[PDB]
Amino acid sequence: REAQEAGFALSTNGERLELTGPGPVPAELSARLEEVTLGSLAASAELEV
Amino acid sequence: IHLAEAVEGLLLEVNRLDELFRQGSFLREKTQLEARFKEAREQQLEALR
Amino acid sequence: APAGLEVEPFPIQMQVILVGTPEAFEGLEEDPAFSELFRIRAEFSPTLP
Amino acid sequence: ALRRLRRDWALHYLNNRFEPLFQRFPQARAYLEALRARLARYAETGEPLDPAQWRPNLLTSSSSGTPPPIVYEPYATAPRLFGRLDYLVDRGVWSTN
Amino acid sequence: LDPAQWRPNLLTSSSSGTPPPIVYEPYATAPRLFGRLDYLVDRGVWSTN
Q1: Which DSSP category does D55 fall into?
Q2: How far apart are CA E40 and CA E49, in angstroms?
Q3: Helices in D1-97 by DSSP H: which ranges?
Q4: Are C4 and D85 a contacting pair, CB within 8 Å?
Q5: Residue B2: enclosing H or E segment and its boundaries?
Q6: Cβ-defined contact of D91 to E43 (cutoff 8 Å)
C-alpha cells in the first residue's frame, strides 16, 4: 500500500520482490523493499528457533 | 565472573549487529551508496553507447 | 602441535612451600639456585619434650 | 565499500555498548578493544564468531583470601604444576583456543 | 600474491646502540639461542614462510 501510494505495484518473484512504476524506484521505497525482504528472512529464521 | 557475563552479552551482540542491518537507517544509506554506484555505471555505459 | 597459541606466560604470585625428608633436601640443596630461592627453612624436630 | 559501511556502523553502535564495559573493566581495555574489533570484522566480512575462541578462560574461581588459595600437588609434573593446553582434532588437524 | 611469504621478517626493532642490545638467556636451548622456524598445517601438510 505504501508503494502504491507512491505509485508502485509489488510483483512477487519468490527470493526477492520488485516494484513496477514510472521511472526508477526511490531510495526510501527501495530501502523499505530490502528491509521487508530481510524482515521476512529473519521472521522465517526466528520462526524456526 | 562479571567480565564473563559481560563478554557473554557481547558474544550474543552478534545477533543485535545482524538486526542492525535491517532497519531503515543503515540500509537506506546502503541504497544511496548502491544507487550512486549504479547510476555511475549506467552513466559510463550510456556514454559508450 | 603445529604452532599452538601465543600464550602469555602466567605470573607466579604464590609462595612455594616444599615439604620433604632431609635426605630429599640435602639431595636437592646442593644446587645454589635452591638456597637462593628457598631461604626459609622450617625444620621439624623428630621428638617433642 | 558496503563492507566499509557495515563495519563503520558496527563500530559506531558498539562504541556505546563497550564504553560501560570500558568503565567497569579498565584493566581489560586491550581485550575489550580486540573483541570490539572482532565484532566489527564479523559485521564486515560476515565470518561467524567462535564463542570458544573469544570467551575468557576463568582459570579458577575468585578467592576471598580467607582461607588463602592452598594447593598441594603430590604429583609434581609439568602438566599439573604449570597447566596444560588441550587440543582438538579436525580430520587430523590440531586446533586449540 | 601471498603477503605473508613476501613481507620481510623484521626480527627485532632497530636499536639505537644506547643502551646496547643486551640479552640474557638462562634457558640456553637451540630454539632460544639460534631462533626457531614456525610452521603451519594444511590438512597434514607443513607450510612455512
Answers
A1: S
A2: 9
A3: 2-24, 29-45, 78-82
A4: yes
A5: helix B2-19
A6: yes
Which parts of chain C fold into alpha helices (H)? 22-26, 32-37
How many A/B residue pairs have CB atoms within 8 Å? 27
All residues of chain D having their beta carbon less than 8 Å from the beta carbon of residue C10 are 82-83
Q: Return the C-alpha cell found at E29.
A: 636451548
Count of beta carbons in the 10 Å neighbourhood of residue A38: 16
Which residues of chain E have a CB within 8 Å of the CB of D91? 43
B37 CA: distance to closest CA in chain D (Å) = 10
Cβ-Cβ contacts under 8 Å for E30 (sequence gap 6 or more):
none
Q: What share of chain A is helix, strand, coil (3-state, %, to 5)?
A: 55, 15, 30
Rounded CA gap, A1 and A19, in Å? 12
Reading the block at residue E21, the C-alpha cell is: 642490545
Contact C4 D96 (CB under 8 A): yes
CA torsion, points E37, E38, E41, E42, in degrees to nearest 10?
-70
| 3-class secondary-structure state, position A25 | coil
Integer Cα distance of D23 and D1 in angstroms: 33
In this complex, is the C-beta atom of E41 within 8 Å of any C-beta atom belonging to chain D? yes
How far apart are alpha carbons A36 and B27 in whole angstroms?
11
- Give the three cell numbers for residue A1: 500500500
Going by their DSSP bridges, the two strands A17-20 and D94-95 should be labelled as unpaired
Measure CA of the first residue to CA of the last residue in chain D; give whole Å. Answer: 32
Write down the residue that cell numbers 561467524 correspond to.
D48
- State the Cα–Cα distance between residues D89 and D25, nearest whole angstrom: 35
- As beta bridge partners, residue A10 has A19
Resolution in A: 2.8
Determine contact, residues C8/D56, Cβ cutoff 8 Å.
Answer: no
Q: Is the dihedral of CA A48, B5, B11, B17 positive or negative?
A: positive
Strands E45-47 and E40-42: antiparallel
